[PDB]
């Protein structure tokens, strides 16, 4: 059993401060978010960093941000605005990335039906759905045999908090 945890953090900062002079209230706007961190897997007591495909071809790993306007019934691709990503604090966002792997080492070679799960909301693409678990195999080197597509949740933390 593998526990896939996310350490992906989103830090967001306001470019504009507004003061309503009828009340004195301060309002922050024009958010400028930046995502950082990694996804780690814990297996048999050791931790492994998710890897991304960096080739020129089609299998190159693609990081795509998503935002919902409702509670989660509609998601769309978060496009840049003013050359930045407008991540609003406490806003529901998700990251999708394809062709992820793990290198579990030669001690974990030729294992079959290893169960991937997550303790903080990471989901795995398979059969057109997002699932909370998936089975994978390792090759002769201990690397996961098939490319993995993850959905990584992120809640941006307000730097002004
Ligand atoms: Na005033």
Numbering used by the authors: 50 to 210
From the paper:
S-layer proteins (SLPs) are self-assembling, crystalline proteins coating the cell surfaces of many prokaryotes. We determined the atomic resolution structures of all functional domains (I-III from N- to C-termini) present in the three S-layer proteins SlpA_ac, SlpX_ac, and SlpA_amy. The Lactobacillus S-layers are anchored to the cell wall through interaction with teichoic acids (TA), either lipoteichoic acid (LTA) or wall teichoic acid (WTA).
The arrangement and architecture of SlpA_ac and SlpA_amy are highly similar. The N-terminal part, exhibiting the first two domains (SlpA_I and SlpA_II), is known to be responsible for the self-assembly of the S-layer protein into a regular lattice. The crystal structures of SlpA from L. acidophilus and L. amylovorus and observed crystal contacts reveal the self-assembly formation. A second interaction was observed within this crystal structure, a symmetrical homodimer interaction spanning from Asn92 to Asn176. The self-assembly region (SA) is formed by domains SlpA_I and SlpA_II, building a 2D crystalline network that forms the exposed surface of the SlpA layer.
